Amino acid sequence: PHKSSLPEGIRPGTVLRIRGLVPPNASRFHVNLLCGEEQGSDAALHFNPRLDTSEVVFNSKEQGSWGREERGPGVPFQRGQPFEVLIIASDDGFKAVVGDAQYHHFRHRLPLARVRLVEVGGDVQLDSVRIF
Ligand SMILES: CS[C@@H]1O[C@H](CO)[C@H](O)[C@H](NC(=O)c2ccc(C)cc2)[C@H]1OP(=O)(O)OCc1ccccc1
């Protein structure tokens, strides 16, 4: 798993660019926007492409409890193909862009101000996480 500290946190206008490869026969992977470094800390966003079930799940986690899942329109990821994702913070939520297309808007469930860390985990071969 990859961890990126957010020394200025995430503000409206902060862009996370995540580049990587979905390996052959990948099951699923995730990008988490976390509210602490501790194992089990709250997730403001859990972005979860599931290649094995052909879904992309969006959710939040508070005090160890998951919220209600949102699902994106289709799966803009392929086993054996590289990807580029933008997670863009606005005042009203996160915009997920995949490749050259706006994909999903996730309304804030936790305060933006609480986000401290970006974690990338699961069956993905990460190239880079950049914060702009
Ligand atoms: C599929 S249900 C649940 O959906 C959630 C979004 O609403 C999350 O995607 C959650 N995933 C996770 O909690 C998770 C954590 C770490 C890693 C490396 C991979 C996955 C995921 O939990 P998990 O995949 O552990 O649940 C299935 C399960 C539960 C108990 C025993 C076996 C499998």
Author numbering: 4 to 135
The study reports:
The CRD is about 130 amino acids long, and the β-galactoside binding site is conserved among galectins, while differences both in adjacent β-strands and loop regions explain the variation in oligosaccharide binding affinity. Human galectin-7 (hGal-7) is a 15 kDa prototype galectin with a single CRD, monomeric but capable of dimerization in solution. Consequently galectin-7 has shown major roles in cancer development, by helping either in the elimination of certain tumour types or in the growth stimulation of others.
The high resolution structure of hGal-7 in complex with the 2-O-benzylphosphate galactoside inhibitor 6 shows that the synthetic molecule has retained all the conserved interactions involving the galactose moiety, from which it is derived, as well as offering new interactions. The phosphate group has a weak hydrogen bonding potential with Arg31, while it is also stabilized by hydrogen-bonded water molecules linked to the same Arg31 and Asn51. The amido group also shows potential interactions with water molecules linked to Lys64 and Trp69, broadening the binding capacity of the ligand to a region not previously involved for galactoside recognition by galectin-7. Interestingly, His33 and Glu122 are not conserved among galectins, thus focusing the ligand interaction towards this position could offer better specificity of inhibition. The anomeric sulfur atom can only weakly interact with a water molecule (3.5 Å) stabilized by Arg31. This symmetry-related molecule is unique to molecule B of the asymmetric unit and may also explain why only partial electron density was visible for the ligand of molecule A.
